[PDB]
Design an enzyme around this catalytic site. Structure first.
Site, PDB file in Angstrom:
ATOM      1  N   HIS A   1      -7.536  -8.374   4.211  1.00  0.00           N
ATOM      2  CA  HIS A   1      -7.012  -8.747   5.516  1.00  0.00           C
ATOM      3  C   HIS A   1      -7.852  -8.240   6.679  1.00  0.00           C
ATOM      4  CE1 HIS A   1      -3.403 -10.884   4.536  1.00  0.00           C
ATOM      5  NE2 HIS A   1      -2.882  -9.889   3.845  1.00  0.00           N
TER       6      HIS A   1
HETATM    7 ZN   LIG Z   1      -0.597  -9.007   0.727  1.00  0.00          ZN
END
Ligand SMILES: [Zn+2]
Ligand SMILES: [K+]
Ligand SMILES: [K+]
Ligand SMILES: [Zn+2]
Ligand SMILES: [Zn+2]
Ligand SMILES: [Zn+2]
Ligand SMILES: [Zn+2]
Lengths: 183, 385, 5, 353, 576
Positions: free
Chosen positions: B150
């Protein structure tokens, strides 16, 4: 109270600009290709040949010089949205670094001149001018507005920063939006 | 072109014997994000204990990759962000209030303790893991402390501060022409898809839940720009997907990718928040419906690199990771757990199985028909490797 | 928004 | 050491009787590791070394919240970028910070006869731009502001509404969710994602009949002895046409961001790709939107800004019919004669050899 | 038409208008002569993509992407990210795991530093007073981490004094290492004792809510089943199927779809199971008097013996084999006076259309019904389908449960909950289906709590057998509807007509029309009507919703049958 008539095309231009700098998170591309000085110089140099009497020319030149001075003194104070003050700060920094003061008329385009024009009636009604002088200023501004509406196809194109290039607006990163708005 | 299938058990391939390498640093488990945040590097300790009590250490080599330096981290991230990460601490945080808003490191991702060291461990493990795959000298490389898919180039998002999958894929690209990255988390691998969005040398393929769900990216129509157009596959699904449905969606897409792209190396991110009974996920997979993806990706027989990921319940993730490593070593492990240090987390049955719910599945056959037809139509244009 | 805490 | 932890009590303390009452009914092999791990530093980059008032709780300029530099004389507070000129949050000058207004007051010593004096002298000096004299004198007495369009400009377009913090909204904003504060409370597992209950989402609320999907012409209500046959009907936010989620390939219910728009509205922006832009105006209501009915029907162009009757051009279905047929017929015959002339030129060029 | 839209864009838009019509869309295709394309990324100017990024070599600029950008704040449209629901028992599990993790974190960190201090102490004592006076430790204590021992000692030693004690340890460990080691030792043992005392309570609480946390459809079933099993829903389903059939057969190219509902009954003992359940409920309940009880019992018995054509002797032998192990026609009961006296005694066109097509040895029978009979039949089919689901899971679930590999290493340590077992509710190697039926009989009798029935049905099978939590209310409603089918006069007459027709051995179209007119004679002109057709050879049932102008039999495919049927209906003076 004072009243100014703006063509509806320029009103839609202003509403579009309000939509961009707000929930589209775009800023303007600076330094602009056509700045305030260039617009006002072209306007004055094109109109000064129109009417012959010297008084019209004196009034025109005085109006243009005052508009330049006033935009310079008003831009940072009142003419910027909240997202566009980090841009103003970065320009101020990179100017003070080069020992040169920032001069906003040679950087900012015609949309900020349009903002100043639109906000002019309240600034006029907040002072203690005459009534003759208020109506003279409003007349000069309406003439400038019709001249600018004749050229609106030259200063206010739509070009999609996301698509090709060189539109009048640019996209902002999440660091710019984090430091500008949510700080 | 979707068709329903059953789910037959997992049987290992006797021919595919791969020299697996396992990376574990005995210090990573001691750094805790906060009181009550759902991220625990403790789940990597738990798993390891299971792996060591089943006797899986006699089957593979165990290493401890030397941790990444501030200048191998900046191969992807910027110098200012890495400097902030290296300098910040929970006490001087009030002095960095302008970079806590620029780099997003204050509250969703907090500053807790030894953050730089956790990031160093993750990145070093994965870059080193990928570097041993290039030197000719492994076949699979397991590293569960990685998988922070992320983190962006100059921002943290989603409890992730350093994107080490990108460092590993950069280290892989020095010797392999084409690399494939499969992401079976319940979220979208937005950082890895952003970092390689305009390149035709890394092909990202992510199966995720799309809706009003974090991070809100990854529609069917995100296929890349520039020279890397049609080299990014997003498979969005609905809640409650199960093992047979996930299998019938996963296997054809991946077989088509491998037939047309022909990758030289794979990177499979096997984060386990797509299991049943998670704190943030909404899927209904079991342990074996989660390890079947790993077995299928292992089927094809090219250098593979398995990394960790999400997972918010510690026992489910620990057991699934142990089972996956076991079947990577060509054994199916017993279902009765052995006596280990964290024996009491695994009540009340004390077995190696994760149970699904009776949740309602909403992925109809016509929706998956449409999705797979679009995906194959796109992939038709990536053939000539 | 974001992921929980 | 006596300080409570997540468990409810000190760490060196067993459970209380209340918890154990309401919670009750009545060698290992990873000793190793420091023997098998051997470091790996096989990586390629190992060469790299690596009046006691209080100030307001909102900015005086943008009227929003954050971390403010405050003024001591007056209860105003400003953001750091919301000043003139913006201030660096690190290098803040300590000492007495006053705003523009209080600084103007202390400069004139709160004496307006001196204001008379200085303003008269100022207007005498700025003789070049005498029209903008008094204006150019007032700008120095105001604390900064941000720009907000005058209200005589926003009210020319009635589909435009100022948002919460002075943001743009244009009727495509769905709405904020009010009883979704009621949603955080909810009815138990009766979700706002619309799962597990679709008997009454296929039934027209007011009339009483079923919502029939536009593409497949069926309301697949299923049967709730077999709930795997329902098909998640949803209606468009503009025309209220019902669609199945599997027919418009969407997989979601649009709940938060904007309104969902059926595939049955034309464009609102084109990008011709030849590239040019819009053929669609804005809705200038206030009863200043004037219509025109052209006296010639089969050739008028005028915009993509028509209105269909049984500046906005009033046009009828017959003229649209004729214009469509005319355009396609003439484009057909023109492209065919172009191919004809190209191929005949080809034949005289080839027989030329 | 005004050169604003491209041709393929026009065709793609018209595809959303005339897509499902093949003729018109193909004609349009043949007559008309037939950048960020993703919604999530923005292009920044090439003036924001200039950051140092020291370690990037020439390939990392060629491969990595620096211009297109996404972020989950403008992909959410500045307001978004709903989250899953996570029912209450999952929260109870989450808090237990949080307390567990907290204790384990503190204990494990304390020991990770205790071992290091142990080795440095046993190395530091081996010196003479000279080196002890000159000894000092480097930052890190010779280990690989630099922040673990700091965190531990600050948590243990009142962080101010923690700082001065840690810098004294760094300065001269010859004097401060022993006391720090002693403090770490004692607090380790304290925390560990508290941790085991807390491990007991955590195990019992988790043993109660683990299985309850895992059924998302059984915690909401008793309240979703009384709202969705009413009359309006059961009629709306068949209505919607009907309107779908008509609305989509307006598309002429598709073949004609036949009647609305179709059921099949592969097992014939579930009928005796449902009869036993209903009998138990009737014998327990106090709502009816004893006459009403035996009348209901016999009504249900002979109705299922009549509709499905099961012999009364086979029924009695089935209940014989059932109940020995636990240690006239229906019209006789229809007009109840009969049963009370019983148990107290204890031209050319029409003619040749009629001539060919006589169905002898009839196998397909019809029942024209109002809403009462339809709703009764639907309750019956509901109970049948649920019992059949569990009877088909039966063999696999019993093979699973009889071979549960319970580890004695968890048997001895009180690590397994016997609370379900000592009360006899765990499915030991008995049959699973028979145990479920016995438990449901005890629940209907009122001798078993609801919580224990549901917990048994969770643990024994899975969260897969949740549809039996309401097995008492469905039987309540079944007996109530079976009483409705003999209190009313109109429904009594309808069932009498059904008895007379079913007992008949031969029929024709004329008699079917006469029977439909007869049954419609009793119910109003606004009533709904259903045709329930039983095919005996395969034990199949079909339900057809009759719109008042319906063809009372199923649609044929030939001109002959269709037109001869309606022209032989022309014989009777009833409207066409
Ligand atoms: Zn995740
Ligand atoms: K994913
Ligand atoms: K790519
Ligand atoms: Zn402000
Ligand atoms: Zn002040
Ligand atoms: Zn549909
Ligand atoms: Zn619509």
């Amino acid at each position: 109270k004072i009243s100014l008539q703006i063509p509806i095309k320029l009103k839609s231009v202003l509403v579009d600009d309000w939509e961009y700098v707000t929930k589209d998170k775009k800023i303007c591309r600076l330094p602009a290709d056509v700045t305030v000085e260039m617009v006002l110089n072209k306007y004055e140099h094109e109109v000064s040949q129109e009417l012959e009497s010297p008084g019209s020319q004196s009034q025109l030149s005085e109006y243009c010089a005052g508009l330049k001075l006033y935009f310079d003194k008003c831009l940072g104070n009142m003419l910027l949205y909240r997202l566009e003050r980090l841009q103003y700060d970065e320009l101020l920094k990179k100017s003070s670094k080069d020992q040169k003061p920032l001069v906003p008329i040679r950087i900012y385009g015609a949309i900020h001149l349009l903002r100043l024009i639109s906000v002019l009636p309240e600034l006029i009604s907040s002072t203690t001018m005459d009534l003759q002088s208020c109506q003279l200023l409003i007349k000069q501004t309406e003439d400038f507005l019709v001249w600018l509406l004749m050229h609106v196809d030259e200063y206010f194109n739509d070009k999609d920063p996301n698509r090709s290039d060189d539109a009048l607006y640019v996209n902002t990163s999440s660091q710019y939006e984090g430091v500008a708005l949510g700080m | 072109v979707y068709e329903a299938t059953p789910f037959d058990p997992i049987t290992v391939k006797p021919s595919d014997k791969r020299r697996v390498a396992y990376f574990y640093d005995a210090d990573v488990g001691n750094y805790a994000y906060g009181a009550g945040h759902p991220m625990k590097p403790h789940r990597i300790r738990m798993a390891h204990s299971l792996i060591m009590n089943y006797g899986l250490y006699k089957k593979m080599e165990i290493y401890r990759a030397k941790p990444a330096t501030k200048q191998e981290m900046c191969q992807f991230h910027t110098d200012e962000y890495i400097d902030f990460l290296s300098r910040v601490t929970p006490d001087n945080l009030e002095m960095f209030k302008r970079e806590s808003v620029k780099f997003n490191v204050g509250d969703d991702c907090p500053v807790f303790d030894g953050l730089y060291e956790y990031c160093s461990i993750s990145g070093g493990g994965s870059m080193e893991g990928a570097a041993r795959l290039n030197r000719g000298k492994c076949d699979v490389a397991v590293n569960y402390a990685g998988g922070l898919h992320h983190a962006k180039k100059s921002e943290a998002s989603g409890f992730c501060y350093l994107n080490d999958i990108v460092l590993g894929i950069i280290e892989l690209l020095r010797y392999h022409p084409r690399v494939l990255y499969i992401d079976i988390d319940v979220h979208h691998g937005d950082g890895v898809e952003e970092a390689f969005y305009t390149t035709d040398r890394v092909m990202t393929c992510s199966f995720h839940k799309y809706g009003e769900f974090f991070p809100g990216t990854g529609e069917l129509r995100d296929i890349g720009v520039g020279a890397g157009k049609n080299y990014a596959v997003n498979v969005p699904l609905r809640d409650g997907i199960d093992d047979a449905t996930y299998r019938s969606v996963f296997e054809p897409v991946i077989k088509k990718i491998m037939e047309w792209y022909q990758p030289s190396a794979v990177v499979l991110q096997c984060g386990g928040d797509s299991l049943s009974g998670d704190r943030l996920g909404c899927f209904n997979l079991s342990m074996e419906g989660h390890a079947n993806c790993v077995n299928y990706v292992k089927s094809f027989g090219i250098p593979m690199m398995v990394v960790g990921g999400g997972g918010y319940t510690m026992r489910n993730v620990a057991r699934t990771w142990c089972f996956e490593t076991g079947l990577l070593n060509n054994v199916v492990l017993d279902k009765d757990l052995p006596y280990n240090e964290y024996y009491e987390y695994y009540g009340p049955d004390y077995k190696l199985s994760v149970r699904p719910s009776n949740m309602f599945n909403v992925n109809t056959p016509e929706y998956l028909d449409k999705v797979m037809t679009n995906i194959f139509a796109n992939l038709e244009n990536t053939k000539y490797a | 928004x974001x992921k929980x805490x | 050491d006596s300080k409570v932890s997540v468990t409810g009590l000190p760490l060196n303390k067993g459970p209380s009787e209340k918890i154990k009452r309401e919670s009750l009914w009545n060698d290992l092999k990873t000793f190793l590791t420091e023997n098998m791990t051997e470091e790996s530093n096989i990586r390629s980059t190992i060469g790299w070394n690596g009046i006691d008032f209080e100030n307001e709780d909102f900015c005086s300029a943008c009227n929003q919240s954050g971390s403010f530099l405050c003024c001591d004389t007056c209860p105003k507070s400003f953001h750091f970028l919301c000043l003139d000129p913006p201030i660096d949050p690190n290098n803040l000058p300590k000492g007495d910070w006053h705003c523009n207004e209080c600084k103007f007051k202390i400069f004139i010593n709160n004496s307006m006869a001196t204001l008379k004096k200085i303003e008269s002298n100022f207007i005498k000096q700025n003789n070049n731009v005498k029209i903008f004299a008094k204006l150019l004198f007032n700008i120095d007495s105001h604390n900064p502001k941000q720009f907000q369009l005058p209200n005589y400009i926003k009210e020319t377009f009635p589909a435009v509404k100022t948002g919460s913090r002075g943001q743009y909204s244009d009727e495509n904003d769905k709405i904020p969710l009010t009883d979704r504060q009621l949603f955080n409370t909810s009815y138990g597992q009766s979700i706002t994602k619309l799962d597990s209950y679709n008997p009454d989402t296929h039934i027209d609320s007011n009339s009483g009949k079923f919502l029939i999907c536009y593409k497949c012409n069926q309301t697949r209500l299923g049967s709730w002895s077999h709930p795997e046959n329902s098909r998640l009907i949803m209606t468009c936010d503009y025309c209220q046409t019902p669609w199945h989620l599997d027919c418009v390939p969407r997989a979601s219910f649009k709940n938060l961001g904007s309104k969902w728009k059926c595939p049955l509205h034309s464009p609102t922006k084109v990008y011709k790709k030849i590239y040019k832009v819009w053929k669609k105006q804005r809705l200038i209501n206030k009863k200043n939107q004037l219509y025109y009915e052209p006296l010639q029907k089969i050739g008028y162009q005028n915009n993509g800004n028509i209105q269909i009757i049984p500046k906005i051009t009033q046009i009828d279905e017959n003229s649209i019919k004729y214009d469509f047929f005319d355009k396609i017929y003439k484009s057909k015959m023109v492209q065919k004669r172009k191919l004809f002339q190209f191929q005949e030129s080809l034949i005289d060029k080839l027989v030329s050899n | 038409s005004q050169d604003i839209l491209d041709l393929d864009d026009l065709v793609e838009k018209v595809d959303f208008y005339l897509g499902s019509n093949k003729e018109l869309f193909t004609w349009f295709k043949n007559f008309v002569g037939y950048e960020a394309f993703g919604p999530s990324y923005k292009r920044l100017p090439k003036s924001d993509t200039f950051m140092p990024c020291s370690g990037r070599d020439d390939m990392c600029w060629e491969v990595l992407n620096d211009e297109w950008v996404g972020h989950p704040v403008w992909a959410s449209e500045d307001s978004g990210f709903i989250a899953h629901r996570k029912n209450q028992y999952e929260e109870t599990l989450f808090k237990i795991e949080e307390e567990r993790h907290e204790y384990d974190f503190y204990i494990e960190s304390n020991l990770r530093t205790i071992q290091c201090l142990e080795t440095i102490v046993n190395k530091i004592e081996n010196m003479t007073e000279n080196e002890k006076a000159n000894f000092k430790l480097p930052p890190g204590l010779g280990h690989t981490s630099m922040t673990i021992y700091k965190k531990v000692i600050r948590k243990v030693y009142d962080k101010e004094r923690g700082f001065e004690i840690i810098d004294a340890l760094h300065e001269h460990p010859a004097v401060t290492a022993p006391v720090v080691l002693k403090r770490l030792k004692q607090k380790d043992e304290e925390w560990r004792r508290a941790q085991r005392e807390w491990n007991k309570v955590w195990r019992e609480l988790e043993q109660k809510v683990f299985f309850k946390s895992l059924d998302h459809l059984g915690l909401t079933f008793k309240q979703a089943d009384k709202k969705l099993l009413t009359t309006k829903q059961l009629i709306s389903e068949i209505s919607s199927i009907k309107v779908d059939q008509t609305n989509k057969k307006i598309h002429w190219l598709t073949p004609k779809p036949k009647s609305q509902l179709d059921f099949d009954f592969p097992d014939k003992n579930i009928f005796y199971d449902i009869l036993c359940l209903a009998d138990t409920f009737i014998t327990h309940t106090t709502a009816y008097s004893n006459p009403d009880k035996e009348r209901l019992k016999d009504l249900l018995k002979y109705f299922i013996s009549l509709f499905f054509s099961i012999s009364f002797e086979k029924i009695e032998e089935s209940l014989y084999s059932h109940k020995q192990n636990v240690s006239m026609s229906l019209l006789d009961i229809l007009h109840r006076s009969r049963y009370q006296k019983l148990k107290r005694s204890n031209g050319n066109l029409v003619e040749e259309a009629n001539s060919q097509g006589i169905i002898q040895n009839r196998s397909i029978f019809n029942l024209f019904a109002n809403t009462n009979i339809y709703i009764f039949f639907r309750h019956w089919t509901t109970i049948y389908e649920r019992l059949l689901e569990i009877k088909q899971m039966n063999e696999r679930v019993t093979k699973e449960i009889n071979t549960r590999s319970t580890v004695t290493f968890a048997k001895d340590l009180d690590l397994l909950s016997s609370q379900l077992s000592e009360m006899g509710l765990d499915f030991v190697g008995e049959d699973a289906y028979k145990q479920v039926l016995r438990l449901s009989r005890r629940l209907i009798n009122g001798d078993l709590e609801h919580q224990w029935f549901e917990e048994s049905l969770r643990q024994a099978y899975n969260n897969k057998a949740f549809k039996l939590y309401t097995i008492d209310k469905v039987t309540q409603s079944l007996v109530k509807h079976a009483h409705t089918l003999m209190t009313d006069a109109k429904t009594a007459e309808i069932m009498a007509l059904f008895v007379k027709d079913r007992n008949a051995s031969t029929t024709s179209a004329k008699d079917q029309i006469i029977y439909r007119l007869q049954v419609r004679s009793h119910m109003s002109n606004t009533e709904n009507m259903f045709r329930i057709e039983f095919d005996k050879r395969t034990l199949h049932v079909s339900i057809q919703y009759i719109a008042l102008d319906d063809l009372t039999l199923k649609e044929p495919k030939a001109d002959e049958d269709k037109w001869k049927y309606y022209v032989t209906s022309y014989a009777l003076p009833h409207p066409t």
